[PDB]
Amino acid sequence: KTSFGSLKDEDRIFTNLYGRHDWRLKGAQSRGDWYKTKEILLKGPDWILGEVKTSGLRGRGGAGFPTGLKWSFMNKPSDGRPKYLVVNADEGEPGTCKDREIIRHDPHKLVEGCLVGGRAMGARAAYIYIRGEFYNEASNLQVAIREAYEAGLIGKNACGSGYDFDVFVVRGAGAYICGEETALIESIEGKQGKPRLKPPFPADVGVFGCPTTVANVETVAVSPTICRRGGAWFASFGRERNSGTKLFNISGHVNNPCTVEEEMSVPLKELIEKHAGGVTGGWDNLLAVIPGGSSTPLIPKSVCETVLMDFDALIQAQTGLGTAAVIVMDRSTDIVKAIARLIEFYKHESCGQCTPCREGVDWMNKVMARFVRGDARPAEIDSLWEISKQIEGHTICALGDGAAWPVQGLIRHFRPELEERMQRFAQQHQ
Amino acid sequence: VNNTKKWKMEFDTRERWENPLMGWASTADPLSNLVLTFSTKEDAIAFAEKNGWSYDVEERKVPKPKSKSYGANFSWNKRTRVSTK
Amino acid sequence: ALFVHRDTPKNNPETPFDFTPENYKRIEAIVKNYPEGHKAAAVLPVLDLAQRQNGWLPISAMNKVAEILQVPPMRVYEVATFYTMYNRKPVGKYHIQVCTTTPCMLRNSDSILEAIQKKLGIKVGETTPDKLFTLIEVECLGACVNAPMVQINDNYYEDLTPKDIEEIIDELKAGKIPKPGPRSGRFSCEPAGGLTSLTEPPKGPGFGVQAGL
Numbered sequence: 001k002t003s004f005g006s007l008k009d010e011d012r013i014f015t016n017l018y019g020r021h022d023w024r025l026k027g028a029q030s031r032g033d034w035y036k037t038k039e040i041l042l043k044g045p046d047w048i049l050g051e052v053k054t055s056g057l058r059g060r061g062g063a064g065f066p067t068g069l070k071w072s073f074m075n076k077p078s079d080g081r082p083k084y085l086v087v088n089a090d091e092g093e094p095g096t097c098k099d100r101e102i103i104r105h106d107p108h109k110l111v112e113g114c115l116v117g118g119r120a121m122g123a124r125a126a127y128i129y130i131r132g133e134f135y136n137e138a139s140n141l142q143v144a145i146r147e148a149y150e151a152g153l154i155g156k157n158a159c160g161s162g163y164d165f166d167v168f169v170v171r172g173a174g175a176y177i178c179g180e181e182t183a184l185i186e187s188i189e190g191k192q193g194k195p196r197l198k199p200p201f202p203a204d205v206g207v208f209g210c211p212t213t214v215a216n217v218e219t220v221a222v223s224p225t226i227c228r229r230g231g232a233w234f235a236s237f238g239r240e241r242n243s244g245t246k247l248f249n250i251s252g253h254v255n256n257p258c259t260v261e262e263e264m265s266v267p268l269k270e271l272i273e274k275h276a277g278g279v280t281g282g283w284d285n286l287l288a289v290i291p292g293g294s295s296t297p298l299i300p301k302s303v304c305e306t307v308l309m310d311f312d313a314l315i316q317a318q319t320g321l322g323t324a325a326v327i328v329m330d331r332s333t334d335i336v337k338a339i340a341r342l343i344e345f346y347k348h349e350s351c352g353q354c355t356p357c358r359e360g361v362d363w364m365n366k367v368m369a370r371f372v373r374g375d376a377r378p379a380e381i382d383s384l385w386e387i388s389k390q391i392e393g394h395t396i397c398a399l400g401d402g403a404a405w406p407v408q409g410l411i412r413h414f415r416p417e418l419e420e421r422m423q424r425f426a427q428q429h430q
Numbered sequence: 431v432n433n434t435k436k437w438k439m440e441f442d443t444r445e446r447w448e449n450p451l452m453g454w455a456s457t458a459d460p461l462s463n464l465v466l467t468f469s470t471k472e473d474a475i476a477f478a479e480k481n482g483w484s485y486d487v488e489e490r491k492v493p494k495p496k497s498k499s500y501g502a503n504f505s506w507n508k509r510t511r512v513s514t515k
Numbered sequence: 516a517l518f519v520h521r522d523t524p525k526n527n528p529e530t531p532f533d534f535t536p537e538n539y540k541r542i543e544a545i546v547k548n549y550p551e552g553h554k555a556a557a558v559l560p561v562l563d564l565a566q567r568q569n570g571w572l573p574i575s576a577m578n579k580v581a582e583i584l585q586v587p588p589m590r591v592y593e594v595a596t597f598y599t600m601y602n603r604k605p606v607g608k609y610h611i612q613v614c615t616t617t618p619c620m621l622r623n624s625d626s627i628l629e630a631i632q633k634k635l636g637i638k639v640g641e642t643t644p645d646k647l648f649t650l651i652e653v654e655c656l657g658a659c660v661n662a663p664m665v666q667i668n669d670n671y672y673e674d675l676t677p678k679d680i681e682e683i684i685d686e687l688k689a690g691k692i693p694k695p696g697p698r699s700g701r702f703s704c705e706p707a708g709g710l711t712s713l714t715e716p717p718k719g720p721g722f723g724v725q726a727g728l
């Protein structure tokens with residue numbers, strides 16, 4: 001296939017994405033969920049890991065690590081310690097609200113994904129670290145887990161396979177940094193959500209000291225559909241090394257902000273004008289698109305005309321795919337006010353552990369707050385660039401990178417607008 | 431640790447007393463500020479024996495190599511878990 | 516907004532806090548979710564339970580969570596001051612949380628923040644004199660396609676106009692509890708002018724299942 005997009009409704013993983021069907025167990029089993037789960041479990045860990053490696057599933061959390069390669073880090077003998085699958089249901093990214101829709105509307109798909117994935121990785125239980133702000137979704141998920149226990153689908157002799165597997169839900173308490181997998185581990189362990197250093201990776205030392213795989217809600221929930229439909233079905237969508245389907249959250253300055261499941265390498269312009277009704281005021285009213293939530297660099301209108309919405313074509317467009325959360329910004333936007341608000345978010349959501357983020361993200365927020373007013377000089381733009389290059393790569397987790405990249409995208413694509421802002425400040429205040 | 435690299439020869443501290451006029455530290459010891467620097471211990475011993483100085487040597491106290499592990503802060507069953515970070 | 520504690524007469528280690536016995540059974544069920552020997556992993560739920568029984572956290576809820584989990588009290592103080600939900604001051608009975616990040620600021624959450632301010636007569640951080648409404652300004656609540664939106668105590672009120680949040684505040688003052696949903700026409704997250712996808716009926720069990728399973 002050469003052009004991508006226009007996904008059919010029969011080829012959807014997240015049926016009942018919109019809350020239009022029964023999310024409970026009798027509705028979920030009537031939509032293909034929990035069907036032949038025992039036959040998936042009995043074929044061993046190696047078969048399930050091979051079906052995930054065949055499918056080409058990458059990490060839907062946003063970094064895009066190969067999911068089968070990541071989950072095969074647990075295919076190793078027991079050293080006395082138990083093993084844990086941990087579902088990352090935090091979703092603190094601005095723009096991103098897809099995991100809320102999975103937990104709220106397809107919860108049994110997440111529970112079956114916990115069972116199948118923890119069977120693949122030999123795990124003992126599933127700790128679903130859900131966001132603390134998602135209370136109704138957490139009780140929603142707990143109702144589904146009660147329905148899964150009472151049907152014998154999980155717990156003692158899960159689905160009649162002789163495999164014991166629990167599913168726990170831990171609520172967060174209001175920290176974006178607790179979506180980072182090691183800080184999420186530290187938050188489950190009852191401490192401040194500060195990220196660990198790597199190595200040890202969580203497959204070696206994870207939650208409680210155990211072998212542990214943290215994986216996103218989407219990359220876990222699509223795994224029983226990969227096991228039932230086959231890995232080649234999932235690899236038959238999107239470009240090569242960009243396989244599958246993907247949830248997209250188009251918000252901001254579009255006519256109909258919405259969540260949509262779409263084929264992987266869909267064009268951005270087609271996605272916006274097909275599922276969201278296009279940019280408000282027309283496509284010529286488009287100023288910028290933050291393609292994948294707040295951490296990715298923005299791209300202007302001259303990149304959004306031709307770009308594909310997968311990992312590799314956005315890396316080649318000097319941005320990232322991230323969480324596939326499309327924030328659309330029209331010509332009426334003070335883009336410096338939006339990016340400075342985004343940097344303000346990253347200094348409010350920063351755990352204070354290491355030096356470059358703790359100091360430099362606040363220092364970038366002060367510089368961006370002066371750039372909104374134009375209370376600066378153009379030699380501070382390049383300086384700000386250097387500050388971002390001192391935060392990027394030198395921090396413990398990638399929130400320093402995710403704070404550096406909006407600054408770098410704004411400078412790289414809108415340096416003249418910053419310079420005219422500052423020179424008009426200078427000529428109206430002197 | 432750059433000040434712990436070379437051997438040093440000092441002398442026994444003699445009396446310091448108070449100046450009656452100003453309150454300064456008066457001394458009568460000519461060798462009170464004499465600190466000599468040597469690459470090895472035996473050069474220092476040879477320079478002391480060459481000058482007729484009764485010496486005493488303290489051996490170099492080197493720090494022993496510790497076993498450092500970051501994941502040991504997050505153990506399953508050991509007491510070396512950190513309670514915070 | 517501070518991160519050191521000073522003993523007021525209403526916030527001290529002699530302030531009366533204690534769990535109800537049904538909350539003690541809830542704490543037992545919480546601590547049974549974690550391995551034997553990692554009871555400190557129950558700091559974040561139980562302390563949040565102390566915020567649900569009491570409304571806020573004095574420094575007797577923190578010391579009680581420290582005592583019943585056999586953890587040092589500083590390890591509960593760190594959790595209480597790290598995570599933004601734990602109210603270390605008493606808030607109003609309805610805790611209005613306006614999201615003002617970029618996907619909601621682009622869809623005019625400023626007008627709704629102004630509407631709540633000019634309605635309640637307060638500003639951000641202040642509590643109304645009847646102690647019913649506390650207005651603060653929070654980061655991304657994770658409902659970005661339903662922007663603009665607020666959170667009140669469990670609930671997301673989404674796709675709001677200033678009239679809609681005025682009406683929600685009017686019926687919160689009247690005692691009723693509103694419906695946590697988008698105040699526009701749509702239901703959860705669909706496109707607002709009809710479904711662009713998932714119009715066909717879902718297939719059901721057995722569809723597309725590979726051979727050898």
Ligand SMILES: NC(=O)C1=CN([C@@H]2O[C@H](COP(=O)(O)OP(=O)(O)OC[C@H]3O[C@@H](n4cnc5c(N)ncnc54)[C@H](O)[C@@H]3O)[C@@H](O)[C@H]2O)C=CC1
Nearest residue numbers: 061062063065070091092093096179181201295322323398
């Ligand atoms: N979904 C959301 O709400 C948010 C998502 N993000 C995304 O998070 C991304 C950053 O995530 P990170 O995990 O920090 O990036 P990445 O460097 O670490 O790693 C991604 C995954 O691969 C695994 N991995 C990579 N190399 C490995 C190795 N050698 N051995 C074992 N495991 C290995 C890691 O355990 C991790 O789970 C950003 O690009 C952003 O798009 C950021 C903020 C919020």
Ligand SMILES: Cc1cc2nc3c(=O)[nH]c(=O)nc-3n(C[C@H](O)[C@H](O)[C@H](O)COP(=O)(O)O)c2cc1C
Nearest residue numbers: 059060061088090091092179180181215216398399
């Ligand atoms: C600051 C920060 C916040 C993150 N928040 C989340 C999150 O909320 N949800 C998520 O699934 N991944 C989040 N991630 C990505 C995780 O580190 C991790 O890659 C992912 O949760 C699990 O891997 P996966 O993508 O294969 O599922 C975050 C990363 C960083 C650096």
Ligand code: SF4
Nearest residue numbers: 352353354357395396
């Ligand atoms: S860079 Fe920021 S988010 Fe990461 S460990 Fe340091 S303080 Fe935490």
Ligand code: FES
Nearest residue numbers: 614619655657658
């Ligand atoms: S930006 Fe307001 S909910 Fe995500």
